[PDB]
Design a protein around this ligand. Sequence first.
Ligand SMILES: *[C@@H]1O[C@H](CO)[C@@H](O[C@@H]2O[C@H](CO)[C@@H](O)[C@H](O)[C@H]2NC(C)=O)[C@H](O)[C@H]1NC(C)=O
Ligand SMILES: *[C@@H]1O[C@H](CO)[C@@H](O)[C@H](O)[C@H]1NC(C)=O
Length: 273
Amino acid sequence: DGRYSLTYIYTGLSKHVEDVPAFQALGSLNDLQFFRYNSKDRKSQPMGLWRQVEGMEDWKQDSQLQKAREDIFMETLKDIVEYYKDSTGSHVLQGRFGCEIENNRSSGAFWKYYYDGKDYIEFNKEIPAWVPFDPAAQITKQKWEAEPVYVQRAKAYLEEECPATLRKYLKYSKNILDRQDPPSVVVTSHQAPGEKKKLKCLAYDFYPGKIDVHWTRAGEVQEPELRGDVLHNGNGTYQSWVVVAVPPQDTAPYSCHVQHSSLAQPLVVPWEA
Ligand SMILES: *[C@@H]1O[C@H](CO)[C@@H](O[C@@H]2O[C@H](CO)[C@@H](O)[C@H](O)[C@H]2NC(C)=O)[C@H](O)[C@H]1NC(C)=O
Ligand SMILES: *[C@@H]1O[C@H](CO)[C@@H](O)[C@H](O)[C@H]1NC(C)=O
């Protein structure tokens, strides 16, 4: 088994502008986003390859949970703004929470909030208790620990519930997170009126993202003139390209080299002028 992480991020705005939802939420499994929810549509929706997955989660019921989460999250923001007596201002509250496993063993967990970009409050499950960083967080802490069970629930979420949700999602995400999709490659050239010829090597449709893409000139690795990559979440695939400029009088042989974890051995794709 390897490393898997479940991460949630909540964003609330005290005074949202037109077309921007007051509350937004998203969730990721490793490097991919699997769902989103906002206060406009009010519905938890799977994303990317999880749109094709059935039975992993009941989105209609998750929509109800997120609405409940939303209500408490925004009330927290509302209380902070009230404490500073600045409702006329535009403020933001962001919350991050989740856990991770490695070798089927819980290896991490976190739960922290940020107010206007500054650390606000975080849960330390070893105590177990919330740790305030902002003066208003002292009030929030008081409310979140009003009854003995509250901290017990928080500790249980990070230590029992979250990792159980991750293990469950992992059972339906094998063909997504554990894929070893080999890259397709395409070498292309372009001549700019007045500029040198440029050779572009593109590796696409691969996963995981880690990859080695480079050009060679007469068996000599070259220094790229332009480089880049991207991850398409809808697809769960990456693309990575490298570009080199070639002297107008150069005749040497140019070939692209691609090495990836999914390949038995590296691939070579010479360019035929
Ligand atoms: C996964 O999604 C990406 C992004 O939509 C696809 O890339 C596009 O593919 C079409 C058709 O091949 C091209 O016309 C576009 O130019 C590509 N988008 C760009 C600019 O990267 C990709 O083909 C998809 N791969 C799979 C396996 O479905
Ligand atoms: C860990 O993986 C084993 C099988 O490899 C599985 O039976 C178990 O439910 C998983 N998590 C734990 C420790 O319960």
